[PDB]
Amino acid sequence: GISRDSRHKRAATGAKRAQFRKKRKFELGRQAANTKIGTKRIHPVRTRGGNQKFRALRIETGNFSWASEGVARKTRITGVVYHPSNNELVRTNTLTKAAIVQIDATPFRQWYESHYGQSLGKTSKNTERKWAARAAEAKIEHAVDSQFGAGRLYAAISSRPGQSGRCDGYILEGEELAFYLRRLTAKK
Amino acid sequence: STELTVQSERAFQKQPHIFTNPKAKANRKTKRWYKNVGLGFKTPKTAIEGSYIDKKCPFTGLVSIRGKILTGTVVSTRMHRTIVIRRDYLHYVPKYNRYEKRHKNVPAHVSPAFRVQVGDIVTVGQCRPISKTVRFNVLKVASATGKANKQFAKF
Amino acid sequence: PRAPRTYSKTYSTPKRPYESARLDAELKLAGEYGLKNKREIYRISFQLSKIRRAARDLLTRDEKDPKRLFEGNALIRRLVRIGVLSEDKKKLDYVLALKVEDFLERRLQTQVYKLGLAKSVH
Amino acid sequence: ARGPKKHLKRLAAPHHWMLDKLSGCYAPRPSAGPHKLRESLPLIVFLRNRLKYALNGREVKAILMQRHVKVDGKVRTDTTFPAGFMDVITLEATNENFRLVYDVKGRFAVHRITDEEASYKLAKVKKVQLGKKGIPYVVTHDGRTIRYPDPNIKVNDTVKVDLATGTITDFIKFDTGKLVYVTGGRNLGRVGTIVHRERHEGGFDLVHIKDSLENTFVTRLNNVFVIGEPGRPWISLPKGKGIKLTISEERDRRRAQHGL
RNA sequence: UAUCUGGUUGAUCCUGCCAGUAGUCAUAUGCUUGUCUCAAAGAUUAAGCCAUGCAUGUCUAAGUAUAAGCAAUUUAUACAGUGAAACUGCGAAUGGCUCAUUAAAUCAGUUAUCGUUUAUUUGAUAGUUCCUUUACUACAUGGAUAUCUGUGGUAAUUCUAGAGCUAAUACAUGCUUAAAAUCUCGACCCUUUGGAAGAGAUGUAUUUAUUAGAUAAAAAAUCAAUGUCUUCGGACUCCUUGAUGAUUCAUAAUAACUUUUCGAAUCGCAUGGCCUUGUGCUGGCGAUGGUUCAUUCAAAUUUCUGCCCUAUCAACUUUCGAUGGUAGGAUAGUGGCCUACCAUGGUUUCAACGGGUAACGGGGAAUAAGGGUUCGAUUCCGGAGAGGGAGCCUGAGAAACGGCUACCA
RNA sequence: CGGUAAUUCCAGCUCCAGUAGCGUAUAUUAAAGUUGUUGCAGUUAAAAAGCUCGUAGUUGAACUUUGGGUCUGGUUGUCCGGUCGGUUUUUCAACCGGAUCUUUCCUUCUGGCUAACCUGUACUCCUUGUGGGUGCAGGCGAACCAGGACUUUUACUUUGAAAAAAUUAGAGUGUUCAAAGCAGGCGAAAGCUCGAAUAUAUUAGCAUGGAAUAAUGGAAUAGGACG
RNA sequence: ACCCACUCGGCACCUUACGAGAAAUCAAAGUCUUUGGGUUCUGGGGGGAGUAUGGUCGCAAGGCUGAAACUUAAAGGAAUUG
RNA sequence: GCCCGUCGCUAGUACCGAUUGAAUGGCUUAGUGAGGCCUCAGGAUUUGCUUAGAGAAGGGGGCAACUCCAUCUCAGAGCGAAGAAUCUGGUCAAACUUGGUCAUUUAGAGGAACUAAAAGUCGUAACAAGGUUUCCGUAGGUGAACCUGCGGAAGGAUCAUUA
Ligand SMILES: [Mg+2]
Ligand SMILES: [Mg+2]
Ligand SMILES: [Mg+2]
Ligand SMILES: [Mg+2]
Ligand SMILES: [Mg+2]
Ligand SMILES: [Mg+2]
Ligand SMILES: [Mg+2]
Ligand SMILES: [Mg+2]
Ligand SMILES: [Mg+2]
Ligand SMILES: [Mg+2]
Ligand SMILES: [Mg+2]
Ligand SMILES: [Mg+2]
Ligand SMILES: [Mg+2]
Ligand SMILES: [Mg+2]
Ligand SMILES: [Mg+2]
Ligand SMILES: [Mg+2]
Ligand SMILES: [Mg+2]
Ligand SMILES: [Mg+2]
Ligand SMILES: [Mg+2]
Ligand SMILES: [Mg+2]
Ligand SMILES: [Mg+2]
Ligand SMILES: [Mg+2]
Ligand SMILES: [Mg+2]
Ligand SMILES: [Mg+2]
Ligand SMILES: [Mg+2]
Ligand SMILES: [Mg+2]
Ligand SMILES: [Mg+2]
Ligand SMILES: [Mg+2]
Ligand SMILES: [Mg+2]
Ligand SMILES: [Mg+2]
């Protein structure tokens, strides 16, 4: 149906290319998934070469990830917080690649309580040396700390949730993190 | 031609899968990844010293030069980051046994490493399909100046 | 769709129809060597002309270089075996002058008559 | 149309079958396998047109079902298996083993090989790459992939293959002054030495290859298959031995040799 | 195998045309027709319409058998000989026909896919499923559904509704399983040279990150972190790395997820080897399946260059994607393929755009000195189409039409 | 052509041409140098714009590396067959190269291999000898790589690689001849055995030589070239 | 201001043409079947027709641009004798 | 001699042409929108595992929570898995409806041509200085050729008048 033909597109100059052949399967491109965050659902699809290519549908949760530490968790999503293609996907709350989003952050705390155990927002004798050997490694970039206290970090998902099925993404850190915050204050 | 702003879209563009570590404290900050292109083409330092990201550059991108390494002069430069190379040639016509001077303009992407102007000759490598028409990528502005530094008559 | 079995309209008519002296000269040939048709003559003339056509397209090139030398020799070899060309002449430029009369006198038609057997040709 | 093609029409039949213009609309499509469509040789052509052990396709089919036929150790019951270049075809009834090797003309030849040497198959590269479990592996243009190769088995370099087991006996490097068999169209099935290797960035590696007679010629690397170092090629080659004579030279040898 | 004649004149020589002349795997027809080989043959006009019949189905030692089938006789006290029927598998996307579209499209050569899918093909291959470790399905988990048994309808049809049983390589779940090494956790002692009893996690696919994937050469001073051997002046030495022209490649790591894929509750022939004398533990030749990597058959794009006539088509494209960009969305994947926001490009007298084509492209064909002209529906190779135009199921592969849905005719 | 001897109409006999074919129609190619690039015409036969300007086009003067030597490879005619109708040199030849030297670089180096002796370290296996080589510190690099550095770019032409097969030309061959076809051929006739070529296709791309031809380019604010 | 000789520029004649040309003639209309210096334009039997149409230009007249169907064996040109 | 036109008859070619002409196809506004695919739900039905009480005659190897067995098996009910019609948006978009528009066809009353002509009228324009020399351009006029201005050209009826 929704084909990807170079057949259509008039032409490089203008010459309205005549409809050579009825459009083919191998040219096709299916309906856009635009997956929400409202009760976890996935349908697969039989693509080229068989291939189960899972289409995410109202996907809740995805494993959003640190940089400094290098970790990700069974992390709940909250909402579509800013999408730099089209703002249409912000209000409808449709999740998409490179969309800025908010992360429940409780799993990012619970695991951080082990990793270092210094706590973010504001027992046993030999562990105290592993606790002491670790920690004071990463100080974290302020916005992430306040967002840790908010229970709502700023990720920027990088899976393709109509292709993949998985809604797995990436916690914003540093410059890009500093940038998308300015756009969030511009939009709000 | 445009140009300059680096990060100025609705999105903010990084070199994908490439990182500028906040924990680490180098002088550059930004790990400028770059590509050695091959086919005896030198990487111009304006790419590696510079700022702009560009998906569609050969040096600062995933674009891989291959196949036909065309050439020709540059006629049109007006659009954003692409160029139109005018690849003149002859066409033999046996029933006469002479030649047509024929034309074909070739649209070709610019990595802003190079400074391209109108009336400049330019080698240019085929690569991925960049766009609709642009299947080509500027690799070497041969007339870098072409009497640019020197006009200039009065002794 | 096995393949088109090729053929030739091998034997081809002259480019006028009524050159009086040719009409006689062809009769003379069909009378001497006993030929039911003009066809039998043109057959030889063409069959011959094909050879001539080679000889010309070899003599255009230098005999000393390859095809000229090889295809020409093989062309001569072929003629001497078929027995049209003499053993005096094996020089390619002599092939050019072969003529229809020499071809006909080599047929089984005639080589009956030339070895006796029949008497009176036809 | 609508996916891959199942027939192969006889005029389209690659010429080095020497398939007959008439006596069939179709040709046997060489099935999928280790060798490319036109570079292969399906067994029907091999057993019928070449060797004449079968008088028709039926008899070939049965010949494969009873089953003394063994292309590269394994048996095959496939009438049109791609028995390509180097493929050791052993018929245990008759003991008539054949390696598949090109006659100087280009068309493949029956080489009635020993017990004995028909036991390894020489094979090229292709890759060098690595797979999962970090295993380095080598691939042969002539079909197989072989695991765990010697690190300095490089690309466009041959490899002797144990064939029955399928491992590595030995390898010949590719470089200057090394006997090289040829598998490219016009220079196909010639043999020579190697002088140059024009590197060429993108546009195909060339190789300048003088024969025994020292008539130079050029090919591409992909159409070249290193049979050894000069003097000792690792395979027994047919009468002619990759020379490729001139046209008059062949005419000379034929009409000289008349022994009734 | 380069060839010319008749015709305007009272006659002449030209311009010039007409007429002849020869040939066409170029059509038609008109006569005539004994044989041999060979042999096109509803393209031209209507890609107009179609009765009838046929042209695609397929089982092996080897997926499913109490046909209330056939066998029948010297393996069945769960089965074993043949096998209709049916599900599963695979095939029906091949071939065949045709030429309507279609004029940078197709198509030819040329590249490319570092830009992708690929059942089949023949090569490769998964101790990690366990989740605290003093009594647990694993020598085998479940109920269905078909063919059948009948109960039927109908004016029709390769229409099938209910119940009863009955399977699977069908559909679901689901066990074992080490040793080591590496990463997260940890009863204290003794004032340093600090150092460890022991607990959890680690396949494959998946997802994003993040790091490695190096390589132009020799020799230092010492400032912060401060390690090994101390023969207590101090030494520090042997310190890793594939491929391409070229990578964010191959590949390997740290982090996890996931409506947690895959890791055989499968099948036919063969009946061997040790006795801890159980019917114990063991083992051959095959089949299919199954993972990504390969290869093959291919597949989509795509590079370059190349078309018939028309200026009685000079501008065209850009509201309704035109040209470029950034981001997404989709796709197997690249991309104005689609969407948002932005810029104003793009082609053109080196004929853009438009129109025409009694145009499918090419191979080729006829003609035949050389140069050419015209033809190519048509035996091969591409491409299209199956009354039109759409839309899609299954499937590795279909925008299938000897599949289906629809609307028009 | 046909108005009472019509050689053209219509019939018999002759006769011609072709002949199991030949006619007719339409296309079409040739003939048509009546489409013309090769290759046409234009004072009057058709045809020079009334004139000039003029952008695209197309076209565009001459000039830069010529000549001489010195060897050294071939390739056919010669001089006899030196020979068992074929072959190997010399007396000779033209022709095509190659190396160089001529005020002359052929792209240059960072290194690998320095093959070689320009050598001379012990000087002699040895006819009275500069016939001949076991032999290694300085070191001729073209005998090859394997990496830089950066190429004035084209057209042009070369041989090459590729331009599916059938077709096309064409080699081999007794389909009986052919048109064709890829067959075939020879034994004890107990087994053996040649084949199934070669060429073209020149448009574009790729390869390498050549440097005339033609264009293009470089130092005149030298911001030039070298070290 | 002439004469006379030769010269750059202009406008035309005479004779032979050995050169062209169908010839008339032409020193260009030569250096063309011994076919190639460069370029632009026009013509392809006669008519139908400079018409029909469509542009386009004009106040209009008209121009520029420009058909075929149909038709026909000649239309011409140059010269020869009448 | 040749001959040129107006006007007549007899056929056919094209031309224009009111027709609010007609058709076919190509594009095309607005409205509708078939049918699938995805999507929001929807749940006819089919079942597993829960120890959920039986009658069961050893319902696990001899009165007894059977020396209680995937026990006899339905009221459970909870928890699933699969799952039809139906259905909320999308999307692709046939086709229709009612227009609009290009191209090709094709009736068309009428007009106005042009060509063949058996051969008729009216003149006799041109060709001879064709009896006003022809022509061309261009205006006007006529019954037709034609004529007449103006300018031009000789293809002129002149390569010629010297002082
Ligand atoms: Mg087909
Ligand atoms: Mg490549
Ligand atoms: Mg001719
Ligand atoms: Mg006349
Ligand atoms: Mg007369
Ligand atoms: Mg004619
Ligand atoms: Mg069974
Ligand atoms: Mg890295
Ligand atoms: Mg990678
Ligand atoms: Mg796969
Ligand atoms: Mg994108
Ligand atoms: Mg058509
Ligand atoms: Mg055509
Ligand atoms: Mg065709
Ligand atoms: Mg047709
Ligand atoms: Mg076809
Ligand atoms: Mg039909
Ligand atoms: Mg369809
Ligand atoms: Mg079909
Ligand atoms: Mg059908
Ligand atoms: Mg012609
Ligand atoms: Mg003419
Ligand atoms: Mg005139
Ligand atoms: Mg010049
Ligand atoms: Mg032939
Ligand atoms: Mg005319
Ligand atoms: Mg709908
Ligand atoms: Mg007078
Ligand atoms: Mg008069
Ligand atoms: Mg008068």
Automatic annotation (TrEMBL), chain A:
Pfam families, per the entry:
Ribosomal_S8e (PF01201)
Instruction: List where the protein spans the membrane.
Output: none
Which keywords appear in this protein's UniProt record, sorted alphabetically?
Ribonucleoprotein, Ribosomal protein
InterPro entries to which the protein is assigned, alphabetical? Ribosomal_eS8, Ribosomal_eS8_CS, Ribosomal_protein_eS8_euk, Ribosomal_Se8/biogenesis_NSA2
Molecular-function annotations in GO: structural constituent of ribosome
Any coiled-coil ranges, and where? none
Q: What is one GO cellular-component annotation here?
A: ribonucleoprotein complex
Q: Which domain of life is it from?
A: Eukaryota
What processes does the entry annotate via GO biological process terms? maturation of SSU-rRNA from tricistronic rRNA transcript (SSU-rRNA, 5.8S rRNA, LSU-rRNA); translation
Q: Which family does it belong to?
A: Belongs to the eukaryotic ribosomal protein eS8 family.
PANTHER family in the record: 40S RIBOSOMAL PROTEIN S8 (PTHR10394)
Q: Under what name is this protein listed?
A: 40S ribosomal protein S8
TrEMBL record, chain B:
User: Keywords assigned by UniProt?
Assistant: Ribonucleoprotein, Ribosomal protein, RNA-binding, rRNA-binding
Biological-process GO terms, alphabetical:
maturation of SSU-rRNA from tricistronic rRNA transcript (SSU-rRNA, 5.8S rRNA, LSU-rRNA); ribosomal small subunit assembly; translation
Does RNA-binding appear among the keywords? yes
Which regions form coiled coils? none
One GO cellular component term of this record is: cytosolic small ribosomal subunit
Superkingdom to which the source organism belongs:
Eukaryota
CDD domains annotated for this entry?
Answer: Ribosomal_uS17
Alphabetically, the GO molecular function entries are: rRNA binding; structural constituent of ribosome
Stretches assigned to the Small ribosomal subunit protein uS17 N-terminal domain: 7-70
State the Pfam families in the record. Answer: Ribosomal_S17, Ribosomal_S17_N
Q: Does the keyword Zinc apply?
A: no
Q: Which family does it belong to?
A: Belongs to the universal ribosomal protein uS17 family.
Per its record, how is this protein called by name?
RP41
Q: Which organism is it from?
A: Kluyveromyces lactis (strain ATCC 8585 / CBS 2359 / DSM 70799 / NBRC 1267 / NRRL Y-1140 / WM37)
Automatic annotation (TrEMBL), chain C:
Q: Which UniProt keywords apply?
A: Ribonucleoprotein, Ribosomal protein, RNA-binding, rRNA-binding
Key word Thylakoid present: no
Q: Name one GO molecular function term.
A: rRNA binding
Q: An example Gene Ontology cellular component term from the record?
A: cytosolic small ribosomal subunit
One biological process term from GO is: translation
Q: Which domain of life does the protein's organism represent?
A: Eukaryota
Q: Tell me which residues make up the Small ribosomal subunit protein uS4 N-terminal domain.
A: 5-105
Q: What family does the Swiss-Prot or TrEMBL record give for this protein? A: Belongs to the universal ribosomal protein uS4 family.
Query: What function is annotated for this protein?
Result: Component of the ribosome, a large ribonucleoprotein complex responsible for the synthesis of proteins in the cell. The small ribosomal subunit (SSU) binds messenger RNAs (mRNAs) and translates the encoded message by selecting cognate aminoacyl-transfer RNA (tRNA) molecules. The large subunit (LSU) contains the ribosomal catalytic site termed the peptidyl transferase center (PTC), which catalyzes the formation of peptide bonds, thereby polymerizing the amino acids delivered by tRNAs into a polypeptide chain.
Note the subunit structure.
Component of the small ribosomal subunit (SSU). Mature yeast ribosomes consist of a small (40S) and a large (60S) subunit. The 40S small subunit contains 1 molecule of ribosomal RNA (18S rRNA) and 33 different proteins (encoded by 57 genes). The large 60S subunit contains 3 rRNA molecules (25S, 5.8S and 5S rRNA) and 46 different proteins (encoded by 81 genes). Interacts with snoRNA U3. uS11 interacts with MPP10. Component of the ribosomal small subunit (SSU) processome composed of at least 40 protein subunits and snoRNA U3.
In its UniProt entry, what is this protein called? RP21
UniProtKB/TrEMBL annotation, chain D:
Keywords from UniProt, A to Z, are: Ribonucleoprotein, Ribosomal protein, RNA-binding, rRNA-binding
Do you know which Gene3D superfamilies this protein is assigned to? 2.30.30.30, 2.40.50.740, RNA-binding S4 domain
Q: Which Pfam families match?
A: 40S_S4_C (PF16121), KOW (PF00467), Ribosomal_S4e (PF00900), RS4NT (PF08071), S4 (PF01479)
Stored InterPro entries:
KOW, Rib_uL2_dom2, Ribosomal_eS4, Ribosomal_eS4_C, Ribosomal_eS4_central_region, Ribosomal_eS4_central_sf, Ribosomal_eS4_KOW, Ribosomal_eS4_N
Residue intervals of the RNA-binding S4 domain? 41-105
Which SMART domains does the UniProt entry name for this protein?
S4 (SM00363)
Q: Which GO terms describe its cellular component?
A: cytosolic small ribosomal subunit
- A GO BP annotation: cytoplasmic translation
Q: Which domain of life is it from?
A: Eukaryota
Q: Which PROSITE patterns match?
A: RIBOSOMAL_S4E, S4
- Record keyword Lipoprotein present: no
- An annotated Gene Ontology molecular function: structural constituent of ribosome
Subunit and interaction comment: Component of the small ribosomal subunit (SSU). Mature yeast ribosomes consist of a small (40S) and a large (60S) subunit. The 40S small subunit contains 1 molecule of ribosomal RNA (18S rRNA) and 33 different proteins (encoded by 57 genes). The large 60S subunit contains 3 rRNA molecules (25S, 5.8S and 5S rRNA) and 46 different proteins (encoded by 81 genes).
Family from the record = Belongs to the eukaryotic ribosomal protein eS4 family.
Q: Which HAMAP family match?
A: Ribosomal_eS4
What protein name applies here?
A: 40S ribosomal protein S4
